[PDB]
Amino acid sequence: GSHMWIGVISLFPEMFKAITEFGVTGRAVKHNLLKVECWNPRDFTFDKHKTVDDRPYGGGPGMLMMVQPLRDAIHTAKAAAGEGAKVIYLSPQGRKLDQGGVTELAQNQKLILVCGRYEGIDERLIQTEIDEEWSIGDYVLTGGELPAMTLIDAVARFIPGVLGDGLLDCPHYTRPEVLEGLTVPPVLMSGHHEEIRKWRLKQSLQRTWLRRPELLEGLALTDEQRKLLKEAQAEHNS
Amino acid sequence: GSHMWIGVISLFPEMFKAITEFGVTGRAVKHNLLKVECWNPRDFTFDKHKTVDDRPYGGGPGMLMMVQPLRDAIHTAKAAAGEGAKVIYLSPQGRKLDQGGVTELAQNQKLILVCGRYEGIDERLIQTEIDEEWSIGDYVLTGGELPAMTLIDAVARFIPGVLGDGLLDCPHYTRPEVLEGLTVPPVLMSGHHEEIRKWRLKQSLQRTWLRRPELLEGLALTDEQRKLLKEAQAEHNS
Numbered sequence: 001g002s003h004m005w006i007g008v009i010s011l012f013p014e015m016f017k018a019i020t021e022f023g024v025t026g027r028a029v030k031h032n033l034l035k036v037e038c039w040n041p042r043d044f045t046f047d048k049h050k051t052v053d054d055r056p057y058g059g060g061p062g063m064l065m066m067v068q069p070l071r072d073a074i075h076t077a078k079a080a081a082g083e084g085a086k087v088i089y090l091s092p093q094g095r096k097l098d099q100g101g102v103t104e105l106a107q108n109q110k111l112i113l114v115c116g117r118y119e120g121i122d123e124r125l126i127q128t129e130i131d132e133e134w135s136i137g138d139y140v141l142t143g144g145e146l147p148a149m150t151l152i153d154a155v156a157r158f159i160p161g162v163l164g165d166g167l168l169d170c171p172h173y174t175r176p177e178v179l180e181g182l183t184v185p186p187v188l189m190s191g192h193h194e195e196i197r198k199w200r201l202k203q204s205l206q207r208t209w210l211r212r213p214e215l216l217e218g219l220a221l222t223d224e225q226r227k228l229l230k231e232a233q234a235e236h237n238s
Numbered sequence: 239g240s241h242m243w244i245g246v247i248s249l250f251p252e253m254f255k256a257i258t259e260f261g262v263t264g265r266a267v268k269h270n271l272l273k274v275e276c277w278n279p280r281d282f283t284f285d286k287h288k289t290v291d292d293r294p295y296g297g298g299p300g301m302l303m304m305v306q307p308l309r310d311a312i313h314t315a316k317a318a319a320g321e322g323a324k325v326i327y328l329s330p331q332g333r334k335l336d337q338g339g340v341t342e343l344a345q346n347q348k349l350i351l352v353c354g355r356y357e358g359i360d361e362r363l364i365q366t367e368i369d370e371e372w373s374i375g376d377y378v379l380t381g382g383e384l385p386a387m388t389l390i391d392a393v394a395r396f397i398p399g400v401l402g403d404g405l406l407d408c409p410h411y412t413r414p415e416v417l418e419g420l421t422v423p424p425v426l427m428s429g430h431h432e433e434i435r436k437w438r439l440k441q442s443l444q445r446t447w448l449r450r451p452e453l454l455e456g457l458a459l460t461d462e463q464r465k466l467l468k469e470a471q472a473e474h475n476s
């Protein structure tokens with residue numbers, strides 16, 4: 001129904017087997033809920049050695065992706081996608097991805113993801129070919145493929161059929177009842193669904209406050225959430 | 239010399255071919271600068287169907303990783319690593335990764351990365367087996383493998399031999415001189431190394447100010463950087 005098509009431009013398309021052949025995303029691909037289609041700039045070269053990098057104007061230690069093979073690969077992906085495809089470039093200079101941004105990106109039925117390698121791509125290609133630039137985090141990687149796969153994995157979770165409040169998750173427990181002397185909180189064994197719900201919510205509120213208090217600032221807590229957070233803060237202060 | 243060993247606990251170890259077989263990280267592995275060794279909890283099961291998940295106490299829609307196979311895999315990885323290995327769990331509840339955190343993690347000669355699947359792992363395993371919990375970003379993925387590979391890629395860049403100031407990168411240009419009517423900034427063609435350096439720095443300062451002004455707050459700018467940022471802000475205000 002709400003299946004998603006993702007075109008990828010990458011010098012290493014075989015990396016994408018990590019998401020198309022395994023786990024939840026692998027299942028999504030097999031079931032046609034997600035399609036990932038790759039184009040490799042190396043296939044758009046014409047010289048004997050299939051050159052895909054080029055020297056930066058102004059000098060410097062690094063190389064950039066060569067414009068012509070990359071541009072031709074992007075154009076081919078765009079032609080395959082048809083109308084309505086948003087072209088995304090992954091880099092540390094982009095908009096910071098968070099779950100809200102994931103949900104925004106997931107509204108697209110078609111995306112094209114451009115994966116950089118080496119020390120950059122020509123700025124004029126960003127101006128002329130790229131719709132949006134996004135970053136998965138404030139760290140530097142060797143290429144855009146892992147960020148692209150990260151984005152695909154995150155948006156895939158919103159496609160209906162793929163899976164079976166601003167707070168961190170609560171602790172979870174499974175067998176055995178006692179592990180290294182540590183027991184399961186009795187509330188989780190009580191079978192009281194309402195008590196269990198409130199315990200889990202209180203724990204999420206407490207953990208968010210202690211570990212990521214800035215996340216709480218962005219929330220308008222419900223009356224119930226205000227109460228449970230206040231209880232948690234009181235207990236923390238003994 | 240400063241080679242790094244990374245042990246990985248994962249239900250899908252073949253995903254890690256994405257970093258061990260391709261690009262800069264692939265080269266690092268071939269050259270013995272980086273070693274990535276995987277253990278699969280499925281191999282530590284004893285039942286006929288090799289069960290690796292289990293039901294959460296207190297109920298709920300999800301499953302957790304089964305404790306015994308996961309615990310045994312972690313212990314085996316620890317035994318292989320010997321003394322000094324830091325055990326890392328990847329999840330959205332962890333410390334937010336940034337380049338500074340990458341450089342901190344890169345000081346370790348040995349890491350063990352635990353990759354979760356399903357809806358969590360038992361909290362008591364985090365308490366008893368995990369040294370540090372880290373997040374690659376405020377979004378939710380289907381498993382910890384992509385975050386683990388992201389971390390590996392980022393820290394690998396600091397291993398000497400693997401590769402050939404708090405600001406966003408500047409624009410880069412390569413051939414052709416004119417692309418879709420857009421020309422290369424004449425300064426980059428001038429061959430004046432000092433003018434080129436200052437242009438690039440000014441551009442990084444301008445881009446950081448416009449796109450990520452909060453990053454500037456964390457910096458103590460040099461006199462030169464203060465001057466170039468002021469120039470950029472003046473030109474932006476016409």
Ligand SMILES: Nc1nonc1C(=O)NCc1ccc(Cl)cc1
Nearest residue numbers: 090091116117120135136141147
């Ligand atoms: N952080 C991030 N969020 O998205 N992408 C990144 C990142 O570091 N990419 C590496 C990269 C990106 C472009 C080129 Cl040309 C080379 C390497």
Ligand SMILES: Nc1nonc1C(=O)NCc1ccc(Cl)cc1
Nearest residue numbers: 328329354355358373374379385
């Ligand atoms: N964000 C992040 N930063 O590190 N990891 C993540 C993440 O979403 N992992 C998915 C995940 C983690 C543990 C388990 Cl049990 C299941 C799924």
